[PDB]
Ligand binder design. Sequence first.
Ligand SMILES: [Mn+2]
Ligand SMILES: [Mn+2]
Ligand SMILES: [Mn+2]
Ligand SMILES: [Mn+2]
Lengths: 131, 131, 131, 131
Amino acid sequence: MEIKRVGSQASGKGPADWFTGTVRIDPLFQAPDPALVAGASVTFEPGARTAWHTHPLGQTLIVTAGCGWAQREGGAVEEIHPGDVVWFSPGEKHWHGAAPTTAMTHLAIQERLDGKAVDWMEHVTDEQYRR
Amino acid sequence: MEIKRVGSQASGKGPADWFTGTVRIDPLFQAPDPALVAGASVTFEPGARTAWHTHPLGQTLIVTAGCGWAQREGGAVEEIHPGDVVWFSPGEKHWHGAAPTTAMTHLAIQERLDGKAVDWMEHVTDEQYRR
Amino acid sequence: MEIKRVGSQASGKGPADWFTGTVRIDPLFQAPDPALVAGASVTFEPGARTAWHTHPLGQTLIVTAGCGWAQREGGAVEEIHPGDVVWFSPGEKHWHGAAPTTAMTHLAIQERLDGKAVDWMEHVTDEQYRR
Amino acid sequence: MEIKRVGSQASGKGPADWFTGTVRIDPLFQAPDPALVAGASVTFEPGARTAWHTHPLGQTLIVTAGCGWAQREGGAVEEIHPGDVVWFSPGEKHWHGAAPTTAMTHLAIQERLDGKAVDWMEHVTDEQYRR
Ligand SMILES: [Mn+2]
Ligand SMILES: [Mn+2]
Ligand SMILES: [Mn+2]
Ligand SMILES: [Mn+2]
């Protein structure tokens, strides 16, 4: 047993290849072998969102604050709220972020395959970023 | 892409075989193959706690509300707070719960191994629940 | 500067005359004079709710967990979600609590008028609760 | 009567005269007369904090995420953690904000006295922010 106390895991920023706009990532856990699962709290500023991407064993999102958008490829752009729970299937191309006027914060949970829990792709355009 | 909207998953109660005291279990997500991760929000009334148990692939707690206790065997009873992230190793024997006078809620995340994500053991006695 | 610290204030049961069902009250603050504002976190088990009541200077609810219901007399029963802000106008007879199968938690903020912040009335019947 | 659903109030940025660093203000509520209370959710990025200021009827903080620092003048700087409640007296000169490397979110609740909730004084210097 070990405890990572509050404020002991520093906030980091979203790298510009992977996110449009201002995103802060607050690491929560990365579970050692034989566990595969990792999680972090991600906070998007108004207008911010991830580039298109996929997850090898999928990801679950648990919204914890604010109001944001999310779309799987060829689906519609959905609105998500605190308490909402999202599932993206393995390989499903998708994106998620804040709404244009409000921040959003979510817990993102995903299992790694190699040492690889995400595949990044093209950014989400302004044209694509609408509802 | 699937969304479980807030309020669409019924609250449930912890069965007396697995818990001392009153415990509410709010499921959040589970599975499906090939992914293995499951999660729930677990709320303990003051004085309530899990029985001793283990997890075949480990467990992460993210404390979301109140103030609880937790102890691995051989360890001291720790006090945990919101924003604390707690990890128990695969096979590690332990219990978690509320403190005597305050409720505690946490996000419990674990991976399943051939069907189960917990092995239940004896109750935590009143003498053991002391710190 | 006074800080209380999480875990430091003990939880309480909502008295039977003011609540139907199982309610937990986690006190937060009570400002001294000349300020008038008080706040508590209130947690309603499924199907639990306040009696009908009024607040002499209105009340603001900030839902923090779960899914609840609320109504003023002659109005529709509405769902309240985490992140929602609910305002009850001064003297308006109302009730608020859990949805019938999901718990919920809210921050209740109200100002006291002559050393009182609520007036308690009859319980909300099972019919009024649904209808 | 009224319910402001989550993503319906646009996030705002803290003005440069009142904050050091990047700060987001999410408005929550302002009670109309004869009530005097108002509330916002304020999110400080790592290193960001308010200027020195006072409140005419005092202020209540309820930390909701992350990890932050606070100091009334003549006092030590204190850590505040999620679920902590902080009280500042009317007229008490003080500041609050993020820790140097972790962001922080809190609920700020204060009452207005003839239409003002705060009086703004000088910025907090890098030297005062240490200790
Ligand atoms: Mn994703
Ligand atoms: Mn466990
Ligand atoms: Mn009320
Ligand atoms: Mn202040």
